[PDB]
Design a protein around this ligand. Structure first.
Ligand SMILES: *[C@@H]1O[C@H](CO)[C@@H](O)[C@H](O)[C@H]1NC(C)=O
Ligand SMILES: *[C@@H]1O[C@H](CO)[C@@H](O)[C@H](O)[C@H]1NC(C)=O
Ligand SMILES: *[C@@H]1O[C@H](CO)[C@@H](O)[C@H](O)[C@H]1NC(C)=O
Ligand SMILES: *[C@@H]1O[C@H](CO)[C@@H](O)[C@H](O)[C@H]1NC(C)=O
Ligand SMILES: *[C@@H]1O[C@H](CO)[C@@H](O)[C@H](O)[C@H]1NC(C)=O
Ligand SMILES: *[C@@H]1O[C@H](CO)[C@@H](O)[C@H](O)[C@H]1NC(C)=O
Ligand SMILES: *[C@@H]1O[C@H](CO)[C@@H](O)[C@H](O)[C@H]1NC(C)=O
Ligand SMILES: *[C@@H]1O[C@H](CO)[C@@H](O)[C@H](O)[C@H]1NC(C)=O
Lengths: 50, 469, 375, 50
């Protein structure tokens, strides 16, 4: 979990929101790099989001 | 080392005693061979049980007792739970009053019955309905202890599934003997398949009200749990035919088989204890009474019985004391008011069916019906394409209808199993439109006798021949 | 119409005073008919001896109800399980004195068990009323792994789900564990700052010690503690600002037993007009049968309302326990117990005395602390 | 189809023919004397809705 430096489009909106209202935000990156939907694992009778 | 078993006037005593003695002597050689002390008492009384406990503890420190019974009384198991907890003697549940597991045993008790929990019945019913593709749900319940948690479990199980069952609200009766409020709540009763979680006494009046409203039709279905259908010999005239019930009976496992399984489990537990510890369990100095402090210096058998393997089958138990692989046979009411097996459940917690669809007929009233119209369809035409069921915990896609095909086992053994498949195509869409317009259920059949057919020897073959016949 | 009723009582003086009480209850307003005898027994520790004595005395004396009192030793549990199990063979109703265990509330395990005291699960209504009057929305629940705790949390969830409100977190404890630092830190790392405690006395004491160690007794926190979790070492180890619940008329053996015997006498007098009465056998050996009048007794007990007695009214719920009990608000001020309200029927009945809060605050705090920390 | 009652004072056949009663607007060609019992049965079934 090395420190990266992400910037782009949504960062401006996030900064605007933090300026309008008091926010202390920390960004994170998903390990699998997927949006996340319903998946099937062992004991397939389970509906969990990844 | 010392095992005791009791039965009430079941059969001849000496032959059963000899068989039980021979039981552990056929195999499973262990340094401390277990003995059998079999006694036949027809009386089930508290102080009689206390005297039996005193006799067994004075009888070479009987390590465990197997309790058998003939009557159907749930209070016997409740009374015996306290005795088992106090005497520090494990007791197994066999057919009889203690066969059913309803009360929750104390954590310090050593009671483990052969019965099945309600949750297992719920998932068995869910599997049966999934096989029947009965997505319509209707839960009619009455105020009884433990039903609210069962409803919570069944809803948190159904909503977790990917099938997408109906989410009809539970139609809970306010109280028994309602001559007016039942008609008020009758508005919410609008479905096809109704699940009934009630008692045997009120089941008669519930079914009478259903008959008055007319729920005994071919399209309507009823599922009754094991507690209501406790006795298969007492069949009231108000029970409609085609009812689906799940229970367990001696039709597939006799008393000899059950006691064999019990003694095998006891021997495996004793062997595990001897492998782990090097102490012989001993009973209390006094069989009953509270004169000294309650202490259990020796570890119990709860962790030893987690892993049990006997005769190639893992007859293990869970933390709550439930069988991992119970019997859970399925019984459907016969035309002449009998019960027959239509599938088992011991096959690695899977579902088995004998492929018998039409078994429902109205008997409370007389009303013929012919909505079940069979339809025969081919496979070679591009307008209808068949697909195998995907082994991904789901039957098939939602945009199709079930169909059946006969597949011969070999090139000479003519025997076709009714494999369940889903047929999709343009003709399937036409059939769906016709079903939604005319409002009649339509079945599906697949051609297996060659091509369409032609007039040969003044005999029609194929689909045309089936239509003519 | 001559019957005998057996009783299980603590000491000889209590036995004779209850005998004279039931005699005068026979001689009071309910009279001018065939009377009934009186039988009493002690809570003898020997289980086999007490069971055989109960059989020989009560069962041979045509008993229709069982009078079971609280054990003479509060330290020892002495749960009235064997008596209920014996009475369940013939569906014989019993009348517990002060058994508040939630296991007896369930009718599946105990087919015939009646009592005039609500269990700990009935405190869910009081907690819900407190939340409604104090406008609490974000709460957490601390329940130990036990049947009573599971019943209480299920009751709380069922009572709270009607308003579409859900607790942020529900933690679990164990009967014997002493390390709860991780669970306490998890509870602290939450928006809610109100704690509801329902567990054994030792577990409550150790979790309160851990909370005091981690500075959880400061300002901005409200503690809700059950009835049995405030006594014992809790009073010594708990400073001021801790709320609690106390039951009015919770421990009055004479009054409760008098009310119970009056209720059962009126019920049996009303039911004696029935066509048939089931007679128990002279001994509990060799007889295996069920009473046709068992369900009749249960129905007549459920459908009977008694507005006359020591209490304002006596009625039974679906579980058969007492309904609409007297709940008194209990507060700890200067290491002393202070009552700041009585809830006769779970209504808004405050008092003029000011309610103190942990950390010396004199105003009601709020559980909304977003902290502007959004990952 | 017309839901024609077989005969008056039917404590069981009315419940049998109740299956055909599934609509919103009902036309009642009956008499005043039997109208009371018809409306009582409708109230029991719950036909007095908005
Ligand atoms: C919250 O935002 C307001 C914006 O006017 C600012 O004045 C205030 O100091 C902020 N509070 C905190 C704790 O950051
Ligand atoms: C105990 O259970 C484990 C669980 O996998 C199993 O591997 C092991 O063989 C069992 N041992 C005995 C003696 O049953
Ligand atoms: C098709 O016709 C041939 C005649 O050439 C006949 O031998 C065969 O059995 C027929 N097949 C079917 C499936 O009818
Ligand atoms: C009532 O109880 C028994 C009869 O069952 C008897 O021994 C006792 O003397 C009776 N008491 C009176 C006052 O008659
Ligand atoms: C409790 O457990 C934690 C583990 O996070 C440990 O750091 C702490 O020392 C333990 N406390 C005691 C008293 O054992
Ligand atoms: C509690 O407060 C004291 C002083 O008030 C402080 O020394 C201690 O570190 C605090 N503990 C925690 C866990 O915040
Ligand atoms: C309980 O109340 C009754 C009547 O209200 C009274 O006679 C009895 O003494 C009280 N109990 C105690 C322990 O004071
Ligand atoms: C209970 O207290 C309320 C006050 O909120 C009162 O209105 C009601 O009459 C009381 N009921 C009884 C039975 O005392």
């Amino acid at each position: 979990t090395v420190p990266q430096c992400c910037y782009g489009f949504c960062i401006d909106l996030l900064i605007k929101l933090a300026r309008t209202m008091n926010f202390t935000y920390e960004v994170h990156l998903v390990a699998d790099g997927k949006f996340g939907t319903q998946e099937r694992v062992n004991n397939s009778n389970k509906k969990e989001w990844n | 080392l010392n095992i005791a078993v009791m039965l009430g006037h079941s059969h001849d005593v000496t032959e059963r005693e000899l068989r039980t003695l021979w039981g552990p002597e056929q195999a499973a050689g262990l340094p401390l061979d277990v003995n059998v002390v079999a006694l036949l008492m027809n009386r089930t009384d508290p102080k009689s049980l206390i005297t039996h406990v005193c006799d067994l503890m004075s009888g070479a420190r009987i390590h465990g007792l197997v309790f058998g019974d003939d009557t159907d009384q749930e209070a016997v198991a409740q009374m015996l739970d306290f005795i088992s907890s106090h005497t520090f003697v494990p007791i197994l549940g066999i057919h009889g009053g203690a066969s059913m597991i309803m009360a929750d045993k104390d954590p310090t008790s050593t009671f483990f019955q052969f019965g099945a929990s309600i949750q297992q019945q719920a998932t068995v019913m869910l599997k049966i309905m999934q096989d029947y593709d009965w997505h319509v749900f209707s839960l009619v319940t009455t105020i009884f202890p433990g039903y609210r948690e069962f409803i919570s479990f069944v809803k948190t199980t159904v909503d977790n599934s990917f099938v997408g069952w109906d989410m009809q609200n539970v139609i809970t009766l306010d109280t028994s003997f309602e001559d007016a409020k039942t008609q008020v709540q009758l508005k919410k009763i609008h479905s096809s398949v109704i699940l009934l979680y009630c008692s045997k006494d009120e089941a008669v009046l519930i079914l009478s009200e259903a008959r008055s409203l007319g729920l005994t039709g071919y399209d309507f279905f009823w599922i009754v749990p094991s507690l209501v259908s406790g006795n298969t010999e007492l069949i009231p005239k108000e029970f409609p035919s085609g009812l689906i019930s799940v229970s367990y009976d001696d039709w597939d496992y006799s008393l000899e088989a059950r006691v064999r399984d019990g003694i095998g489990i006891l021997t495996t537990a004793a062997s595990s204890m001897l492998e782990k510890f090097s102490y012989i369990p001993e009973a209390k100095a006094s069989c009953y009474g509270q004169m000294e402090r309650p202490e259990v210096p020796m570890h119990t058998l709860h962790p030893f019985m987690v892993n049990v393997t006997w005769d190639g089958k893992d007859l293990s138990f869970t933390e709550e004391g439930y069988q991992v692989h119970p019997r859970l046979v399925v019984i459907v009411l016969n035309k002449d008011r009998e019960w027959e097996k239509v599938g088992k459940w011991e096959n690695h917690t899977l579902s088995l069916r004998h492929a018998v669809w039409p078994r429902y007929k109205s008997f409370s009233d007389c009303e013929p019906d012919d909505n079940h119209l069979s339809i025969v369809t081919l496979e070679e035409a591009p307008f209808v394409i068949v697909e195998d069921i995907d082994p991904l915990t789901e039957t098939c896609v939602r945009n199709t209808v079930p169909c059946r095909k006969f597949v011969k086992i070999n090139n000479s053994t003519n025997e076709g199993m009714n494999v369940k498949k889903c047929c999709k195509g343009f003709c399937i869409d036409i059939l769906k439109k016709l079903s939604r317009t005319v409002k009649f259920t339509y079945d599906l059949y697949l051609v297996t006798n060659g091509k369409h057919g032609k007039k040969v020897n003044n005999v029609w073959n194929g689909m045309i021949g089936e239509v003519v016949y | 119409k001559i019957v005998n009723i057996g009783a299980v009582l603590s000491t000889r003086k209590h036995e004779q005073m209850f005998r004279e009480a039931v005699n005068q209850a026979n001689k009071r307003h309910g009279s001018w008919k065939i009377q009934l005898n009186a039988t009493s027994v002690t809570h003898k520790p020997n289980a086999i001896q007490m069971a055989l004595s109960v059989c020989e005395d009560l069962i041979s004396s045509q008993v229709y109800a069982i009078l079971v009192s609280h054990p003479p030793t509060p330290n020892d549990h002495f749960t009235p399980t064997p008596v209920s199990y014996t009475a369940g063979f013939y569906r014989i109703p019993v009348l517990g004195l002060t058994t508040r265990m939630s296991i007896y509330s369930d009718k599946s395990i105990h087919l015939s068990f009646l009592r005039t005291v609500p269990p700990y699960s009935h405190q869910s209504s009081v907690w819900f009323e407190m939340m409604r009057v104090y406008s609490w929305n974000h709460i957490i629940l601390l329940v130990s792994d036990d049947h009573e705790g599971r019943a209480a949390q299920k009751r709380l969830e069922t009572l709270l789900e009607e308003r579409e409100s859900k607790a942020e977190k529900v933690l679990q404890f164990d009967p014997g564990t002493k390390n709860v630092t991780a669970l306490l830190m998890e509870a602290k790392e939450l928006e809610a700052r109100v704690i509801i405690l329902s567990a054994s006395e030792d577990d409550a004491a150790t979790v309160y010690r851990a909370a005091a160690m981690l500075n959880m007794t400061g300002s901005g926190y409200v503690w809700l503690v059950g009835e049995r979790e405030i006594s014992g070492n809790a009073l010594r180890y708990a400073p001021d600002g801790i709320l609690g619940l106390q039951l009015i008329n919770g421990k009055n053996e004479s009054a409760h037993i008098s009310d119970a015997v009056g209720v059962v006498a009126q019920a049996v007098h009303e039911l004696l007009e029935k066509e048939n009465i089931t007679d128990p056998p002279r001994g509990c050996v060799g007889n295996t049968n069920i009473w046709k009048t068992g369900p009749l007794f249960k129905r007549v007990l459920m459908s009977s309302k008694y507005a006359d007695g020591v209490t304002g009214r006596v009625e039974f719920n679906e579980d058969g326990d007492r309904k609409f009990a007297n709940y008194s608000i209990m507060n700890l001020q200067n290491r002393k117990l202070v009552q700041v309200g009585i809830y006769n029927g779970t209504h808004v009945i405050p008092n003029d005395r000011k309610i103190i809060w942990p950390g010396g605050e004199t105003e009601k705090p709020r559980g909304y602390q977003m902290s502007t920390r959004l990952k």
